Amino acid sequence: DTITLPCRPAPPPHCSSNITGLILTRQGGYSNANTVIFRPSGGDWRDIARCQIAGTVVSTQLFLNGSLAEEEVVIRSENWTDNAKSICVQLATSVEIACTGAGHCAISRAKWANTLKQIASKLREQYGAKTIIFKPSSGGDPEFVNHSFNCGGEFFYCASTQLFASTWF
Amino acid sequence: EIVMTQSPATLSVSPGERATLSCRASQSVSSNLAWYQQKPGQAPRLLIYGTSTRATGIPARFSGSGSGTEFTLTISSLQSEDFAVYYCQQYETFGQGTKVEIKRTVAAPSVFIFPPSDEQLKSGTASVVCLLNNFYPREAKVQWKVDNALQSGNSQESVTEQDSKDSTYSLSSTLTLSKADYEKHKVYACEVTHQGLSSPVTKSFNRGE
Amino acid sequence: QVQLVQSGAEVKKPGTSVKVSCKASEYTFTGYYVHWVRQAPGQGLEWMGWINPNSGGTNYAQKFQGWVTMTRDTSISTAYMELSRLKSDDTAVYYCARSDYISSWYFGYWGQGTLVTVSSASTKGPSVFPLAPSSSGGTAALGCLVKDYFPEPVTVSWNSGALTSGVHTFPAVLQSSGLYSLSSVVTVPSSSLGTQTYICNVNHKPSNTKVDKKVEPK
Ligand SMILES: *[C@@H]1O[C@H](CO)[C@@H](O)[C@H](O)[C@H]1NC(C)=O
Ligand SMILES: *[C@@H]1O[C@H](CO)[C@@H](O)[C@H](O)[C@H]1NC(C)=O
Ligand SMILES: *[C@@H]1O[C@H](CO)[C@@H](O)[C@H](O)[C@H]1NC(C)=O
């Protein structure tokens, strides 16, 4: 089983990349419960650029062909208590995304679940032993509400809604 | 959930004196705290940021301090425009606010009572007004007795802002009854308890007299 | 100079939705975050969320998630705040604030605020009743009762501005019926009763009602 992401236009098969990192925004407020909610970053290119874990590919919500961590996932932030500051997530082992060329790119469900589980473990380290929830993007312009990237002179928009629908304990 | 607690809820300061406002965080937070001033009818104005840095144009008498879970705003010498509501802020969370009011000598209220007008009785409703005029401090107790029976849930109180000239308060308590209920009883009274009165003052009238 | 100008006050039936504007000027609109803060009548300040004007990304407080939508129009430098399925709890003044620098939380600039009243009541003019003096030393008290009007505000004047000293006009109170009510009172010398006429001038702009009521002893 794989996670299928709708992409427009159709990314050619040679644009398949390695997911090496993520950038997230922690939701503000509180729910009177031991839950912490994270979404794909609501910032702009400034948040992405300052992570410093990106490659030559220009991408949003996901670092493609970027730097990888050595041993385990590493999360960084300029201020963990400032929800206006994005959280840079650097994977240790990348997750491959395969674009068939018919308008959708695929991701291994089991491999993506394990990486999310590792990130939630590291997030619990910075915010206490709490429930970690991933939710889709809060909204924005198409290049930021979607996972976007450049490849061979073209720009592609992929809906990352299915990539953040999990709850972890 | 970080909670910012400001004390006191209301700060009474004699004009020209020093005022100290407190702001306590539930858990230890970074020294990124801001103080805002809000006069009535206006948006908040930034006073301090970074826990000790004045915003541009803010008079030197405002100073900020604190670290960890305790933060303090200090006004060296209160002035007329300085009496307002003050909020401390850390990221997304605000304090409930502290109101700095003018502290003057105790003034006893002058108590008046008004029977409902006959025109209002024609509409099937009756309103009895008890008035407390030009008193300080704001703390006052007003109770309604109808045939010596204490009233509950059928009165509303309105309080004016501190007077611009003598810094006193005025209060009105309105008892709302139907015309049927109003004419079932004879004597209507309000009991006023205030610090400036040696014993509580009662104003009463007999219906129809 | 840098300023934020918000849309006018609105009165909304419960369950509807309202959209509030916030136009920015004299600065680079896309370079600073825009936050929305609401203040219930007499209560404190509550943060609802921020929007990145450069990208349109948003971060809402968990209380308002699913009820608030924040957008912007970079061309006209305007930020929009929409609240859906309004409740009486949502009656407040809604402010837009701008960060001192990029994404700071030091709100050095604020809008004038937009008042949103959520109520099922319809526009209704006030009924004015006298508070006649009767029988405190040499001083007598009289006033007017302004009852059952919607919405706010109501202005009160005595003797067309000739009588100002000793006048107290209390803030309006919201009755259980959804209608506002207030009183205006004045203290006058007892000797002036029966020789000086006292008239309270009540105006209610939303209903175009204007009442001049004479208050008479006994
Ligand atoms: C990422 O790397 C792969 C393998 O080198 C390459 O084929 C692909 O085009 C790269 N992705 C992008 C978006 O350029
Ligand atoms: C991803 O990384 C692997 C090595 O881990 C490399 O062989 C491959 O070319 C990279 N790109 C893709 C698209 O798999
Ligand atoms: C991060 O927070 C610290 C205090 O912990 C503050 O000094 C610093 O300026 C903040 N960094 C930002 C706002 O980029």
Author numbering:
A (entry chain C): 1 to 169
B (entry chain L): 1 to 91, 96 to 213
C (entry chain H): 1 to 52, 52A, 53 to 82, 82A, 82B, 82C, 83 to 100, 100A, ...
Which passages does the manuscript contain on this structure?
The engineered outer domain (eOD) germline-targeting version 8 (eOD-GT8), which was designed to activate VRC01-class germline-precursor B cells specific for the CD4bs on HIV Env, exemplifies this strategy. VRC01-class B cell receptors are defined by their specificity for the CD4bs and by using heavy chains derived from variable (V) gene alleles IGHV1–2*02 or *04 paired with light chains containing a five-amino-acid LCDR3 (4, 5, 32, 33). High-resolution X-ray structures of eOD-GT8 monomer complexed with Fabs of five VRC01-class bnAb precursors with >90% germline identity revealed a conserved mode of binding to the HIV CD4-binding site (CD4bs) via IGHV1–2-encoded heavy chains, mirroring mature bnAb interactions.
A key feature of VRC01-class bnAbs is the ability to accommodate the heavily glycosylated HIV Env surface, particularly the conserved N276 glycan. While many mature VRC01-class bnAbs achieve this by incorporating deletions or flexible residues in their LCDR1 loops, the G001 trial-derived VRC01-class bnAb precursors remain near-germline and generally lack such characteristics. Unlike mature bnAbs, the precursors have an intact germline LCDR1 with the glycan positioned between LCDR1 and HCDR3. In G001–59, curvature in HCDR3 creates extra space between LCDR1 and HCDR3, allowing the N276 glycan to fit without steric clashes. Our structural analyses suggest that the N276 glycan can be accommodated without requiring LCDR1 deletions or hypermutations observed in mature bnAbs.
